[PDB]
Design a protein around this ligand. Structure first.
Ligand SMILES: Nc1ncnc2c1ncn2[C@@H]1O[C@H](COP(=O)(O)OP(=O)(O)OP(O)(O)=S)[C@@H](O)[C@H]1O
Ligand SMILES: [Mn+2]
Ligand SMILES: [Mn+2]
Length: 267
């Protein structure tokens, strides 16, 4: 049924191919688990759980899952996920090839991502892995959020929240933080915290205030700083409490109104 074509991308756990669905005559994206990792029950299981979770989320700003299954190969079972094809590019790719977005475009993209997260949140689903590589922009300029994570027993870590680094509890305000990180990066060209290892970035997330975006790149404003720095507050109580509160402040800033977030001052 699915004639596989060119690879679209590589992630840490998978290869994603373009394919033609021969029945419905559409282009789909097929995510196939890396053959080496499929031998490890823990990766095989993670892959299966992620697909199931993502099939429970139907929304125009979330990449849809169409089908699941396992190919019986000479080397063994190889699981895959058939999903909505996004003809486009990730924010990671965008920052890499074109650099930071204009403030207005950044705001728009991140406000549209807030709608995917608000929808998932209200279905009791936390993304857990919000990061530039998991948000695409289509060739018609649609924002698409993908690769929602899964709840676990009690890729990169550069966008995780402080609670995640500490192994503390994780709710919608973790997504808010991580979306703040992405926003930070599409405005400035850099994630808020960088370092020569993951242990060092984790420490930064937990303990060090981010440089205000306006201090790191030209063409930004104090209002925009206020919003970004509020999503990046170390304590979830000080962040936007919902994706919708965050989007509301983004829309105010887009429209030239003062945000509700606390003022950020610099000298
Ligand atoms: N539905 C899609 N349509 C077009 N391209 C896609 C699609 N899904 C993924 N891609 C591309 O494939 C790459 C890998 O997709 P992911 O699902 O995020 O892989 P992953 O192995 O789960 O990644 P991590 O974050 O390392 S775990 C992305 O960077 C995109 O370039
Ligand atoms: Mn991913
Ligand atoms: Mn993934």
């Amino acid at each position: 049924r699915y004639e596989l074509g060119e690879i679209l991308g590589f992630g840490g756990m998978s290869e994603v191919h373009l394919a033609r669905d021969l029945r419905d005559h559409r282009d789909v994206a097929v995510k196939v688990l890396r053959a080496d990792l499929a031998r490890d029950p823990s990766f095989y299981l993670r892959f299966r759980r992620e697909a199931q979770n993502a099939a429970a989320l139907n929304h125009p700003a979330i990449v849809a899952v169409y089908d699941t299954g396992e190919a019986e190969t000479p080397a063994g079972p190889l699981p895959y996920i058939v999903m909505e094809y996004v003809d486009g590019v990730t924010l990671r790719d965008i920052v890499h090839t074109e650099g930071p977005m204009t403030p207005k475009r950044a705001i728009e993209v991140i406000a549209d991502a807030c709608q995917a997260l608000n929808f998932s949140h209200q279905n009791g689903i936390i993304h857990r892995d919000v990061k530039p590589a998991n948000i695409m922009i289509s060739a018609t300029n649609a924002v698409k959020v993908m690769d929602f994570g899964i709840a676990r027993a009690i890729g990169t870590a550069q966008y995780l929240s402080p609670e995640q680094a500490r192994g503390d509890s994780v709710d919608a305000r973790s997504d808010v933080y991580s979306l703040g990180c992405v926003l930070y990066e599409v405005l400035t060209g850099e994630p808020p915290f960088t370092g020569d290892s993951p242990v060092s970035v984790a420490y930064q997330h937990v303990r060090e205030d981010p440089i205000p975006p306006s201090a790191r790149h030209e063409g930004l404003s104090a209002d925009l700083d206020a919003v970004v720095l509020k999503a990046l507050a170390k304590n979830p109580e000080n962040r936007y409490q919902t994706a919708a509160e965050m989007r509301a402040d983004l829309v105010r800033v887009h429209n030239g109104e003062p945000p509700e977030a606390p003022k950020v001052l610099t000298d």
